[PDB]
């Protein structure tokens, strides 16, 4: 039974989260923010990122030099990084070095230069960002993923934005961007390891007390998406490996299904030839796969966002002339989600999830992510026991239930990259989501 | 010279990226009322002449000789038949 999350308030709303760990001798403090690139429009998209590049470029006391040699001295480092709806910033140092970071972070976030000589030099660092994230095959196929199943949709943006928007992205857009929404209400402060509840409150008042709060002050984790079942290819016969994604619509954070699809998510699991024990794995789709080298490997996943989400399997394979046996199964493995789905596999996937979900948490910095995750996205940390108790709640009938509405003959969103003359036209794999024998 | 899913007989492709999207989510007839007006008339038009062309040329042709057949069995054309055999 791990130690207690408190949580204390600011009078502008800001939240203070924090799990002592009297066993280490570290400390993550840093500022999980509710805001990311989807709160950009098409115009400024790429705001969010530019920023955090220049959130490290210096503030109104230290310099770029002086910040560096700050950072150092502490002993730790500092890290951050944006997403669709989530920016982190966060500080990993020595027990005693907590409140010199939580000064650092205060200052990046709430004095930052933005000035103009900064933002003309990190504009070419992330115009060489963009021809090099290519090499980075499981964020391409990511990225078309969600550009294609959020069609022309927020959600649908890149995180990086278009090359335009970063030679026009100027420092007033900027600092509106960050006044717009890095407000009190927005941000979490969360402290995990060697860390004070009492003393991270006490610094949390004298740095982030002078913090706006918004207009409208909506709860921590409040958002219409329209899936668009589509296809994006992106062939390239000289690479060696497939990369191929399949997602439906998911399930957002706040679902009533959160915790169904995570089990459905969990029968059919990952896989990876270069793991030992992955030829001995109980889901079918693993036997499958192994038994007739199918793949290199394939990881299932369902992502939540605060009013949607992506569920599904993110395949790579070498074997060129089988992807179609490949796709084929995997989507056959889908359907018996919905036929033939009982007890067995459901109580199994149960038991593997109640403690995945707890070892998940093996340091401070994963503790201090799960804070931040959950208080930004539910406005509360879930104890383990609550968690518990949702995932028996799953039975074999709520599996079935949601597999039948959610994937059985359901649209998809599909993306291939590399040698993929092997994968089959949109119809042939979509047919796929049903059983006709059924 | 064709060889299958997988090894097609393609010269290797890259840099191309197709996109489309589920029959479910698109409109099967979309554009059909211009499609059936304008469509057609241009691709009837750019082929007109190949059809019209021949058929016409024959269409005369056979006209000619069977309204002389026609004429050289009648009385007026007893003198021309007995020539012509």
Do not use: C
Request: hydrophobic letters at 35%; aromatic letters at 10%; zero cysteines.
């Amino acid at each position: 039974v791990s130690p207690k999350t408190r949580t204390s308030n600011l009078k502008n709303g800001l939240t203070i989260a924090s799990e002592s760990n009297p066993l280490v001798q570290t400390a993550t403090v840093g500022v999980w923010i509710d805001a990311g690139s989807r709160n950009e429009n098409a115009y400024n998209n790429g705001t969010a990122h530019f920023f955090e590049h220049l959130a490290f470029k210096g503030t109104d006391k230290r310099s770029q030099h002086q910040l560096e040699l700050d950072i150092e001295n502490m002993g730790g480092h500092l890290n951050a990084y944006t997403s669709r709806e989530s920016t982190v910033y966060y500080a990993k140092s020595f027990k005693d070095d907590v409140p010199k970071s939580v000064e650092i972070l205060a200052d990046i976030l709430q004095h930052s230069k933005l000035a103009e000589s900064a933002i003309d030099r990190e504009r070419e660092v992330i115009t060489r960002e963009l021809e090099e994230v290519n090499k980075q095959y499981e964020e391409v196929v990511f990225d078309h993923l969600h550009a294609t199943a959020f069609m022309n949709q927020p959600l649908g943006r890149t995180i990086l934005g278009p090359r335009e928007n970063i030679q026009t992205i100027t420092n007033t857009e900027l600092r509106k961007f960050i006044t717009e929404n890095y407000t009190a209400d927005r941000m979490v402060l969360v402290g995990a390891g060697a860390v004070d509840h009492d003393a991270l409150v006490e610094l949390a008042e004298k740095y982030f007390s002078h913090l706006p709060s918004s207009q409208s002050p909506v709860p921590l984790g409040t958002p219409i998406p329209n899936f668009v079942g589509s296809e994006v290819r992106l062939r390239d016969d000289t690479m060696p490996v497939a990369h191929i994604a399949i997602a439906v619509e998911g399930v957002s954070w706040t679902s009533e299904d959160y915790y169904t699809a995570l089990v459905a998510q969990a029968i059919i699991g990952n896989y990876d030839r270069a793991v030992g024990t992955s030829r001995h794995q109980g889901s079918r789709l693993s036997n499958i796969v192994s038994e007739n080298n199918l793949a290199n490997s394939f990881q299932s996943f369902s992502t939540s966002y605060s009013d949607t989400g992506l569920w599904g399997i993110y395949l790579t394979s070498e074997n060129t002339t089988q992807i179609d046996d490949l796709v084929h199964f995997t989507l056959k493995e889908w359907n018996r989600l919905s036929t033939s789905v009982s007890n067995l596999q459901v109580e199994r996937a149960k038991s593997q999830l109640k403690a995945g979900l707890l070892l998940s948490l093996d340091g401070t910095t994963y503790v201090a992510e799960d804070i931040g995750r959950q208080l930004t996205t539910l406005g509360r940390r879930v104890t383990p026991a609550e968690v518990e108790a949702k995932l028996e709640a799953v039975t074999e009938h709520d599996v079935r239930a949601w597999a039948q509405k959610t994937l059985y003959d359901k649209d998809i969103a599909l993306v291939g990259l590399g040698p993929i003359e092997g994968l089959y036209d949109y119809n042939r794999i979509r047919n796929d989501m049903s059983m006709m024998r059924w | 010279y064709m060889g299958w899913w997988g090894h097609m007989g393609s010269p290797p492709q890259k840099g191309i990226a197709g996109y489309t999207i589920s029959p479910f989510a698109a409109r099967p007839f979309a554009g059909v009322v211009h499609a059936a007006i304008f469509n057609t008339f241009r691709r009837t038009k750019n082929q007109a002449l190949f059809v019209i062309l021949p058929v016409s040329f024959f269409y005369y042709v056979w006209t000619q000789a069977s309204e002389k057949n026609e004429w050289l069995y009648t009385k007026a054309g007893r003198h021309e038949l007995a020539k012509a055999l």
